[PDB]
Coordinates of N, CA and C in Angstrom, one line a residue:
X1 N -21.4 -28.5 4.4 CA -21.0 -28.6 3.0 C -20.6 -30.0 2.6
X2 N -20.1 -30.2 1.2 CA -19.7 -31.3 0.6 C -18.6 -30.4 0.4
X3 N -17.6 -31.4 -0.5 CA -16.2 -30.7 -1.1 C -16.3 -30.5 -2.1
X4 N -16.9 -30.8 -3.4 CA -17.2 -29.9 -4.7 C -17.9 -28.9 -4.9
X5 N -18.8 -29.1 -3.3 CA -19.7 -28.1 -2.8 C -19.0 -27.0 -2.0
X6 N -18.0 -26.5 -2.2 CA -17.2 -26.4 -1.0 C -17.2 -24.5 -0.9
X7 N -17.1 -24.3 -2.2 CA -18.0 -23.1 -2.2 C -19.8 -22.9 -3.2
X8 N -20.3 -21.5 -2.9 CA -21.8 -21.9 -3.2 C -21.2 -21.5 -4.6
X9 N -21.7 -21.6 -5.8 CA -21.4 -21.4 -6.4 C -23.0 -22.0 -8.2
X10 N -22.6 -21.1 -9.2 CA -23.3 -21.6 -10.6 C -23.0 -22.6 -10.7
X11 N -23.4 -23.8 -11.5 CA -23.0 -25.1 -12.3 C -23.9 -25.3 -13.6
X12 N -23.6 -25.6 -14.7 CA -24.1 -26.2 -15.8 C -23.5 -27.3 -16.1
X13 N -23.8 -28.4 -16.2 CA -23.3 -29.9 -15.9 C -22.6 -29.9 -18.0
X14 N -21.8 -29.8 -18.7 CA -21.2 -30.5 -19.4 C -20.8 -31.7 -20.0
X15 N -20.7 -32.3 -21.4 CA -20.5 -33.2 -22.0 C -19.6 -34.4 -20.9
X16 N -19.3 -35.3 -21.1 CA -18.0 -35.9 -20.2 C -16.8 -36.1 -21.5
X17 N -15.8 -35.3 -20.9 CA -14.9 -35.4 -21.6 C -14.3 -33.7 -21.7
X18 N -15.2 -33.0 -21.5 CA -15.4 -31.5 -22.5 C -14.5 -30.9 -21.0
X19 N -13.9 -29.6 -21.5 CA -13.1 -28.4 -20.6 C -14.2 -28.8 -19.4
X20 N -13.7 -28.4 -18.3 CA -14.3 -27.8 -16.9 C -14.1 -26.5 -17.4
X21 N -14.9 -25.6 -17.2 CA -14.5 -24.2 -17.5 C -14.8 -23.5 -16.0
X22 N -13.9 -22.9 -15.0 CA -13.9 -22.3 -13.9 C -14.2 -20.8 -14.5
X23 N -15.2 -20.0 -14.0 CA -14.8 -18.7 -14.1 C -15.0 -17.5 -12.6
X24 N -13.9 -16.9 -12.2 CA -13.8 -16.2 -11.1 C -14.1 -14.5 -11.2
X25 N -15.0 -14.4 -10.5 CA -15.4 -12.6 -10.5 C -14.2 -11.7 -10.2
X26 N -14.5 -10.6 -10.5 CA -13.8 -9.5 -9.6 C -14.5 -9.1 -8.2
X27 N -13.6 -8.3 -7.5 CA -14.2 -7.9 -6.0 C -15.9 -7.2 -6.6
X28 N -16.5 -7.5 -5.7 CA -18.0 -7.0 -5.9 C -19.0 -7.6 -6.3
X29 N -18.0 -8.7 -7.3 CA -19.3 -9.3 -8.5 C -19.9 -10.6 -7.8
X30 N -20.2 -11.3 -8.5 CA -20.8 -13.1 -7.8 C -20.6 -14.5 -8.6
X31 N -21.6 -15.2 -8.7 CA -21.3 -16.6 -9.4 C -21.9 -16.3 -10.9
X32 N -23.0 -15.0 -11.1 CA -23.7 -14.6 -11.9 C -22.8 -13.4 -13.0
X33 N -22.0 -12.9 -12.6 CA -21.3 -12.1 -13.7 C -20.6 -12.9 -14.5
X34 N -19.5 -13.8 -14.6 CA -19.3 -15.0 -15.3 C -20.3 -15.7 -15.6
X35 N -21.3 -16.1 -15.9 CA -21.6 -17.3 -16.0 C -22.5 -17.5 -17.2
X36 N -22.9 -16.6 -17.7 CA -23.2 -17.3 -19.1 C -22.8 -17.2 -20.5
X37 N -21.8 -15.4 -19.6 CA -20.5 -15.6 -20.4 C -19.9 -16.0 -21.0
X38 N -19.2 -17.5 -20.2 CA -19.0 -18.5 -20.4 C -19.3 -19.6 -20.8
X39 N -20.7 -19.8 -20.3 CA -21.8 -20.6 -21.3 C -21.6 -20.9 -22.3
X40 N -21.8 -19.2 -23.1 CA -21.6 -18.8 -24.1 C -20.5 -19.0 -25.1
X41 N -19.2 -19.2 -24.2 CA -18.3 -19.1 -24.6 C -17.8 -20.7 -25.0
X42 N -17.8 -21.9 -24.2 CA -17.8 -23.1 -24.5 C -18.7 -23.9 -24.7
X43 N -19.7 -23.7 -25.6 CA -20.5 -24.7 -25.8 C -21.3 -25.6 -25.0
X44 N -20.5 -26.1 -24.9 CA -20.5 -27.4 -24.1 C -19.6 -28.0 -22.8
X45 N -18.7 -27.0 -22.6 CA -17.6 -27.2 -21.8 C -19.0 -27.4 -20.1
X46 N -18.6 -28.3 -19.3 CA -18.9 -27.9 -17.8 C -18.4 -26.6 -17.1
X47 N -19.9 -26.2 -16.6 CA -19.2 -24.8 -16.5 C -19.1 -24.6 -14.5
X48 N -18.3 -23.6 -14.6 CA -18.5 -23.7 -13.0 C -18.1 -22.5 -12.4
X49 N -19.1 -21.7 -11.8 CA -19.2 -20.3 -11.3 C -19.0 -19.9 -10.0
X50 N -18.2 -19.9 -8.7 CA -18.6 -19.8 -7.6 C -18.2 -17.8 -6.9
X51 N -19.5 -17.8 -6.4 CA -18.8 -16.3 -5.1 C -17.9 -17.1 -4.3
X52 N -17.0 -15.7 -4.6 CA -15.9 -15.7 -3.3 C -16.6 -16.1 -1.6
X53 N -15.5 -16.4 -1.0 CA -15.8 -16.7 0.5 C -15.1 -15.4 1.4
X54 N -15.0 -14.4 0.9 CA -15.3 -13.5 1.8 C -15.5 -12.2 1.6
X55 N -16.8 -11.5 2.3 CA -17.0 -10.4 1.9 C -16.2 -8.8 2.8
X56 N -16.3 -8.3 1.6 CA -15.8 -6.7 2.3 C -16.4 -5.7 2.5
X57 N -17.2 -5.8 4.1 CA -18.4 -4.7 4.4 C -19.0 -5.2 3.3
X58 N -20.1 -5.9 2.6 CA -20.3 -6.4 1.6 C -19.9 -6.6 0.7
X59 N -18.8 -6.1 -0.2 CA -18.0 -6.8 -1.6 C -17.7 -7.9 -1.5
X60 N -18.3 -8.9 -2.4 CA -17.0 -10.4 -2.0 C -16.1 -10.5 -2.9
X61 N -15.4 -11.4 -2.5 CA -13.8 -11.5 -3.0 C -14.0 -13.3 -2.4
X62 N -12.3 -13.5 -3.6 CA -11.8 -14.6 -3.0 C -10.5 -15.0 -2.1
X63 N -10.2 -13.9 -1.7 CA -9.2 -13.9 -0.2 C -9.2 -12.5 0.2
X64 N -8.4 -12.5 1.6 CA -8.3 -10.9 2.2 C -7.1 -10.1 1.9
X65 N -7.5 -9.0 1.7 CA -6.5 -8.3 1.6 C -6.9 -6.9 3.2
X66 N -5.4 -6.8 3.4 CA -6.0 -5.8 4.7 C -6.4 -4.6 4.4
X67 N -6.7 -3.8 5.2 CA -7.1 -2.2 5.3 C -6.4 -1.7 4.7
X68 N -6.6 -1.2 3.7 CA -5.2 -0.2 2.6 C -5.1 -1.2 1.6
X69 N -5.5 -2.2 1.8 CA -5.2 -3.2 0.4 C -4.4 -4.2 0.0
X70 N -3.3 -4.5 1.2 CA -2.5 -5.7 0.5 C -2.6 -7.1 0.8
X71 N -2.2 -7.8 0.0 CA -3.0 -9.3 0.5 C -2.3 -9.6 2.1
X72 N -3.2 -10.1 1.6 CA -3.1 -11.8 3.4 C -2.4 -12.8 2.8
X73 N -1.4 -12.9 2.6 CA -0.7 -14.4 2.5 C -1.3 -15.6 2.6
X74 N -1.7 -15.8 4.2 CA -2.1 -16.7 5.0 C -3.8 -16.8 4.0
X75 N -4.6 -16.0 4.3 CA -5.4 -16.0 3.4 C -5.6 -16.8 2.3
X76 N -4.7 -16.2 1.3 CA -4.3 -16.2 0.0 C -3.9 -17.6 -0.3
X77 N -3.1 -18.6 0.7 CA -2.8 -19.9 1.1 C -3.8 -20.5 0.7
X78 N -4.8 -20.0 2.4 CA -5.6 -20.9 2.5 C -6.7 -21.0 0.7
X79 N -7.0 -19.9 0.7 CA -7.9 -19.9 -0.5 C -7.7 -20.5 -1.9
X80 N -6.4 -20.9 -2.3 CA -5.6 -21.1 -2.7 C -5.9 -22.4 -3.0
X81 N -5.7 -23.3 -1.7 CA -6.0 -24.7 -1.1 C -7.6 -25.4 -1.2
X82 N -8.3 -23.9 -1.2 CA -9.7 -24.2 -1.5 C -9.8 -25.0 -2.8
X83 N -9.8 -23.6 -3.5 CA -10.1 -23.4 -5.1 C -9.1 -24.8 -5.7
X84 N -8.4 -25.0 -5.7 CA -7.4 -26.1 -6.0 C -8.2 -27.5 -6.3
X85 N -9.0 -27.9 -4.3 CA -9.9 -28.9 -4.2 C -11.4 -28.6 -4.7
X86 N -11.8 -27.9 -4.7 CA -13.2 -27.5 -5.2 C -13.0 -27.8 -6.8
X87 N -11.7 -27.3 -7.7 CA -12.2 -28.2 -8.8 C -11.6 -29.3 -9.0
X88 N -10.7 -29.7 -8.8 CA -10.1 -31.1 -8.4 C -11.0 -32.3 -8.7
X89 N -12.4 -32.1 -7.0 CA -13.5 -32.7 -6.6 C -14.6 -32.7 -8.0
X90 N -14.4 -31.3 -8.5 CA -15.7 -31.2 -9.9 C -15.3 -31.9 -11.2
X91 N -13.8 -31.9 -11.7 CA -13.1 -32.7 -12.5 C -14.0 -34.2 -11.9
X92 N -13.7 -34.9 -11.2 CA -14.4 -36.0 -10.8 C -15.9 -35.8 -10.7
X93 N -16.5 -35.2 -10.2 CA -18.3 -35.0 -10.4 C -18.8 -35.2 -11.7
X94 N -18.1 -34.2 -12.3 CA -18.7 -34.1 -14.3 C -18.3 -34.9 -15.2
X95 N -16.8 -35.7 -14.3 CA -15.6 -36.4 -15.2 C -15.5 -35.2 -16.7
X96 N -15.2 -34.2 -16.3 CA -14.9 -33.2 -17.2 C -13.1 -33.4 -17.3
X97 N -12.9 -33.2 -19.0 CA -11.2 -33.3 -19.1 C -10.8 -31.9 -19.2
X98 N -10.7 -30.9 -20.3 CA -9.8 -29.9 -19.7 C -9.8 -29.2 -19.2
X99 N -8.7 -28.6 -17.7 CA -9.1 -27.7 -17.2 C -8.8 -26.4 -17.7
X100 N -10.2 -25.4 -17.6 CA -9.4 -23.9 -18.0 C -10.4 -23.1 -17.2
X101 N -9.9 -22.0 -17.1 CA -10.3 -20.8 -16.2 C -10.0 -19.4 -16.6
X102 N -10.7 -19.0 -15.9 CA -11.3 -17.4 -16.7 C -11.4 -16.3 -15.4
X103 N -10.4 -15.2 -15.2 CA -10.6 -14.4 -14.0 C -10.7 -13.3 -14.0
X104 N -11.0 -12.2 -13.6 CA -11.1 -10.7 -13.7 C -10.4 -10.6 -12.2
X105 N -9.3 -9.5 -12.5 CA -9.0 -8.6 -11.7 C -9.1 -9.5 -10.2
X106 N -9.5 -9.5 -9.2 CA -9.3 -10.6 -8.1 C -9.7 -12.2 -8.5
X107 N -10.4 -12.0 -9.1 CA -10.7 -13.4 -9.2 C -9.6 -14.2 -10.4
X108 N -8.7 -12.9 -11.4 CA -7.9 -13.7 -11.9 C -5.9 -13.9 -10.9
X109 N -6.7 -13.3 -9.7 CA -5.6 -13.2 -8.7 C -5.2 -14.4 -8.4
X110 N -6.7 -15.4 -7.9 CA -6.7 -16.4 -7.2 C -6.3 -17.4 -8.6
X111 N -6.7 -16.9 -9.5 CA -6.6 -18.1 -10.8 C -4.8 -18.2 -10.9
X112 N -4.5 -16.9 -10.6 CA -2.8 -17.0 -11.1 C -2.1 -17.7 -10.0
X113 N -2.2 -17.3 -9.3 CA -1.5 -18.0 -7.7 C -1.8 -20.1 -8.0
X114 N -2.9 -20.3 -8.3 CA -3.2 -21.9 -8.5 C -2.1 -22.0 -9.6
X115 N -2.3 -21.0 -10.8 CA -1.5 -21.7 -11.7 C 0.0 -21.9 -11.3
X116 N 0.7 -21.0 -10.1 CA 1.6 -21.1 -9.6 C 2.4 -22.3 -8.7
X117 N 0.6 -22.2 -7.9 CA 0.8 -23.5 -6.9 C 0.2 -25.0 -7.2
X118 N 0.0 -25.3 -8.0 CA -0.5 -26.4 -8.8 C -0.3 -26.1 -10.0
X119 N 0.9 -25.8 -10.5 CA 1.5 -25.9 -12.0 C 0.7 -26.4 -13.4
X120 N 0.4 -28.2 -12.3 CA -0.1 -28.9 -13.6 C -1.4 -29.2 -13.6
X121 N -2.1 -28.1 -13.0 CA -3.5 -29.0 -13.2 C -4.7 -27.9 -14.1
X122 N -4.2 -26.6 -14.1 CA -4.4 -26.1 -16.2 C -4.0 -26.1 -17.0
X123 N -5.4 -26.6 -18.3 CA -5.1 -26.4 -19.7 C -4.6 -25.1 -19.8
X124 N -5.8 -24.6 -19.8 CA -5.8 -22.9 -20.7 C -5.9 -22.0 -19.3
X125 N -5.6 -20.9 -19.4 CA -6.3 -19.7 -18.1 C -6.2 -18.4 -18.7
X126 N -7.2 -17.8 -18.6 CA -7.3 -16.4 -19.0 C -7.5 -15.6 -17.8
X127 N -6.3 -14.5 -17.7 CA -6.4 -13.2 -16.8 C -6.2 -12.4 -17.2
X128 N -7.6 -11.7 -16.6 CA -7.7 -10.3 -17.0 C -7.6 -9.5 -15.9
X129 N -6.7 -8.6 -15.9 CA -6.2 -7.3 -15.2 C -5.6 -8.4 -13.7
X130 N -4.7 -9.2 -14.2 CA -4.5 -9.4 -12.9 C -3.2 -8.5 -12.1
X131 N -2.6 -8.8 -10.8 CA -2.2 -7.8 -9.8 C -1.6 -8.7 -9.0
X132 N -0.2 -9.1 -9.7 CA 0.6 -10.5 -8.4 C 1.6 -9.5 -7.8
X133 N 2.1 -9.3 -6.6 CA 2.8 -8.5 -5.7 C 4.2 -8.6 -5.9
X134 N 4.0 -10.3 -5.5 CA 5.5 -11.2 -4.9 C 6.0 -11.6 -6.1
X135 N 7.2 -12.0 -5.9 CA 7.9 -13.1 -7.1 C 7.5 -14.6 -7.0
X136 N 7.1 -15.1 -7.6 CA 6.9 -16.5 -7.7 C 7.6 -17.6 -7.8
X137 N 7.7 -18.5 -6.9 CA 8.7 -19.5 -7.2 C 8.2 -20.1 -8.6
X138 N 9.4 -20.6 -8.9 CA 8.8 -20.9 -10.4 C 9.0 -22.7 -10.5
X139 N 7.8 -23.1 -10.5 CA 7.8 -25.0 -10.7 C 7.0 -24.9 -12.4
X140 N 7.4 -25.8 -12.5 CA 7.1 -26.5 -14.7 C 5.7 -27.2 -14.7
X141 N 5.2 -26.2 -15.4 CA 3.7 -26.5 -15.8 C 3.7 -27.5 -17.6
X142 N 2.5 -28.0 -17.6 CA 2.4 -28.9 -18.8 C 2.4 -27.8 -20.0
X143 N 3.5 -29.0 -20.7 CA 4.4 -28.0 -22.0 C 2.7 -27.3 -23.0
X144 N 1.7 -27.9 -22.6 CA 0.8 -27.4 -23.5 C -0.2 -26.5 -22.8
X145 N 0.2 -26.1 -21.3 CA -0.6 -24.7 -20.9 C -0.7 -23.8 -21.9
X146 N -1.9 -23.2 -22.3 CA -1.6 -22.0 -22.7 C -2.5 -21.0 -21.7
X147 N -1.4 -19.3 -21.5 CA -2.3 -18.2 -20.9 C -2.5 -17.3 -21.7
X148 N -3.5 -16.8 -21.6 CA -3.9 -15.0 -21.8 C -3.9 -14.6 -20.9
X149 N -2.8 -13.2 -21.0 CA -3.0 -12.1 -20.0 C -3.2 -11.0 -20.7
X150 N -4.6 -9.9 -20.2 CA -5.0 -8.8 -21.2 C -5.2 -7.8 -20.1
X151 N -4.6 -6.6 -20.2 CA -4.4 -5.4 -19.5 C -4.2 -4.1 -19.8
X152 N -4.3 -3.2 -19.0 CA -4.7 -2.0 -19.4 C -3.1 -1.5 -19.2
X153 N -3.0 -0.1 -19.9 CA -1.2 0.0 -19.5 C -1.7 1.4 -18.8
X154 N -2.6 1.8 -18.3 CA -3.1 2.9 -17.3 C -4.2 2.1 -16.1
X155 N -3.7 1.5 -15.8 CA -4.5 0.6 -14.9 C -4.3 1.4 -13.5
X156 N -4.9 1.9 -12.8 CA -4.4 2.5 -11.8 C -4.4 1.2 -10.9
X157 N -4.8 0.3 -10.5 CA -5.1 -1.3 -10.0 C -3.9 -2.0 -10.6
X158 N -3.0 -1.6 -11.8 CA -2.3 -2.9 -12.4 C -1.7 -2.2 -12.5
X159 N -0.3 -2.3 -12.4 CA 1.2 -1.5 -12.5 C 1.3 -2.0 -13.8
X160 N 2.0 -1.7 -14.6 CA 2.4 -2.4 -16.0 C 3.2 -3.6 -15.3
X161 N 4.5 -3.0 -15.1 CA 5.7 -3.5 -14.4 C 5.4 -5.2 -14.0
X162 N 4.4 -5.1 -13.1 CA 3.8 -6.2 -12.3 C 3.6 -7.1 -13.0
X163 N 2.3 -6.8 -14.6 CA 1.7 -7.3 -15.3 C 2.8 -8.5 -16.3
X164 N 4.0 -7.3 -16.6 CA 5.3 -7.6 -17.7 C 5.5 -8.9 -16.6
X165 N 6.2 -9.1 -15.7 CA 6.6 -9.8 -14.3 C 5.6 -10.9 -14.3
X166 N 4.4 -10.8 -14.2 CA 3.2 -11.9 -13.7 C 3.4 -13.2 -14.9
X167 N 4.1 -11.9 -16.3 CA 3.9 -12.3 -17.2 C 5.0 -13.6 -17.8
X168 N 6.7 -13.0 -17.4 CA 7.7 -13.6 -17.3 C 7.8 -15.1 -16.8
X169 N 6.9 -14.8 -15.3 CA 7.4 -15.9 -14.2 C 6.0 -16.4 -14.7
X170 N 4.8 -16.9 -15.9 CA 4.7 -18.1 -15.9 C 4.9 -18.6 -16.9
X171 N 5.8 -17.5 -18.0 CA 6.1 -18.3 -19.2 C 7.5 -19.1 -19.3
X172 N 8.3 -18.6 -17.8 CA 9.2 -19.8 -17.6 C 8.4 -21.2 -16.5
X173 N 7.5 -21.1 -16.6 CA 6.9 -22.4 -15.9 C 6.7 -23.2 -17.4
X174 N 6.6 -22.8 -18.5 CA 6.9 -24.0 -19.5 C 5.1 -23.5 -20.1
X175 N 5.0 -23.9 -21.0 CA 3.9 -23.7 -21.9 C 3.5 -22.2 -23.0
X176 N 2.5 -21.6 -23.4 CA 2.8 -20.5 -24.1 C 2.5 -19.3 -23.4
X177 N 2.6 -18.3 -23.3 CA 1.7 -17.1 -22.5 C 1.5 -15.9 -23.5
X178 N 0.4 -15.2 -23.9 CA 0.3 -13.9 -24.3 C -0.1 -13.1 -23.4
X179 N 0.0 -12.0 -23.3 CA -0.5 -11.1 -23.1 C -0.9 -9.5 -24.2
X180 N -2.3 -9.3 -24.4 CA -2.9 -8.4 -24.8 C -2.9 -6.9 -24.1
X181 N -2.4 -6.2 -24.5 CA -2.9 -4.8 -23.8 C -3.3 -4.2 -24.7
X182 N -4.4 -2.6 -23.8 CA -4.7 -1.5 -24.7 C -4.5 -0.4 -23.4
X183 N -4.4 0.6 -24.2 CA -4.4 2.0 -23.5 C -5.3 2.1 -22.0
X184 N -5.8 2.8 -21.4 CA -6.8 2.5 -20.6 C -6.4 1.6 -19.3
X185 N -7.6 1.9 -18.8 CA -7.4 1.4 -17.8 C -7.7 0.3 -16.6
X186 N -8.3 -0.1 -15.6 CA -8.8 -1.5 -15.3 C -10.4 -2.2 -15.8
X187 N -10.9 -1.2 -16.7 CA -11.4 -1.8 -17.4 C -11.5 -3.0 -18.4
X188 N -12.5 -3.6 -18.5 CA -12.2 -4.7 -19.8 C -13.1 -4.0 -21.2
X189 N -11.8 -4.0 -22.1 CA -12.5 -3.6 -23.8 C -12.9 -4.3 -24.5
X190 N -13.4 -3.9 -25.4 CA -14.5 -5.3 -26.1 C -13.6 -5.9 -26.9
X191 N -11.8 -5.3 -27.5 CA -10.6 -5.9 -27.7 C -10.4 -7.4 -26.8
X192 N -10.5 -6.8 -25.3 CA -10.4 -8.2 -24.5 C -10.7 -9.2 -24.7
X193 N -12.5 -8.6 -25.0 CA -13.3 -9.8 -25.2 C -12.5 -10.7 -26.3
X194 N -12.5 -10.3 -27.6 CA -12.4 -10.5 -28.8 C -11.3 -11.5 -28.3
X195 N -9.9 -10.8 -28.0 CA -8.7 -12.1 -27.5 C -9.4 -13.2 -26.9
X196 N -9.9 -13.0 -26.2 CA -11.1 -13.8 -25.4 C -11.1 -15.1 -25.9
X197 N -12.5 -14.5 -27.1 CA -12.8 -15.3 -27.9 C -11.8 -16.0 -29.0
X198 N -10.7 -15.4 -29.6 CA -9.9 -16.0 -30.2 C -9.3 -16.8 -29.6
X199 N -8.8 -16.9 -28.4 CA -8.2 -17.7 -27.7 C -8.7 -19.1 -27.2
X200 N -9.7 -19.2 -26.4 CA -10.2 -20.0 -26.4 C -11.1 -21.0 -27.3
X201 N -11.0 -20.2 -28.5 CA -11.7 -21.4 -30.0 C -10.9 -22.2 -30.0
X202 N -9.4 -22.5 -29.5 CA -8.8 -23.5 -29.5 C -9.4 -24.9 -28.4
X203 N -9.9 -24.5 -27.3 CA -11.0 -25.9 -26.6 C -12.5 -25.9 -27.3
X204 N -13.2 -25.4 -28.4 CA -14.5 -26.1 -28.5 C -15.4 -24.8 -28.0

């Protein structure tokens, strides 16, 4: 491999200047469920789609969790460290300026943990149904982050509790955070979408 190559992943080369737009699957899905989505969604923004690096008996994902389900730390670290450099490396490829990101249910796992462990290096991030365990140290992200967090309040995958929590610890990291809910459960509603869309008309 290369390092922006670092996982396989979609690309649509964008304007220079325009969002990087990351978007991350859920367990199962690939580089192809996000991705024209998104397209669709910024214009023009550089887009950037990758499958996780590791599969479950075939599912892929973007870190492990063990037999019964709970993450791998060490994993979660490492993958963590990936995703971090992989767009890092693509910010420089496309010379793309904002960063924002888009995750479902594991893939907005990996998205939350970055925004944890590299504070400052997103604009916007949207999670959907995400699932953080631990408590987060809490380091100060740029006063003009903004998140969407949109969840089901019957999620059998998403405790509320966790979601309220996921929710707290990044809106003391400094910038704005919503969170959207509806009834139901780890599904995404076409409500979602819609926040979705509202939200992100603020990059283009």
């Amino acid at each position: 491999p290369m390092t922006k190559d670092s996982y396989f992943h979609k690309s649509r080369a964008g304007v220079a200047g325009a969002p990087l737009f990351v978007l991350l699957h859920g367990t199962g899905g690939d580089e192809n469920q996000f991705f024209d989505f998104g397209a669709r969604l910024l214009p023009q923004a550089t887009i950037l789609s990758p499958v996780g690096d590791v599969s479950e008996h075939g599912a892929a994902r973007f870190f492990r969790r063990t037999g019964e389900g709970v993450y791998d730390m060490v994993d979660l670290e490492r993958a963590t460290g990936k995703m971090a450099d992989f767009i890092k490396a693509n910010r420089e490829h496309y010379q793309a300026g904002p960063v924002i990101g888009l995750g479902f249910s594991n893939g907005a796992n990996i998205l939350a943990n970055v925004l944890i462990e590299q504070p400052e290096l997103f604009d916007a991030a949207v999670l959907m149904h995400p699932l953080i365990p631990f408590e987060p140290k809490i380091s100060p992200a740029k006063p003009t982050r903004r998140v969407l967090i949109t969840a089901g309040e019957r999620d059998p995958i998403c405790p509320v509790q966790l979601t309220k929590a996921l929710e707290e610890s990044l809106k003391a990291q400094g910038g704005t955070v919503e969170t959207v809910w509806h009834p139901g459960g780890h599904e995404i509603r076409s409500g979602e979408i819609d926040a979705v869309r509202g939200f992100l008309a603020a990059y283009g």
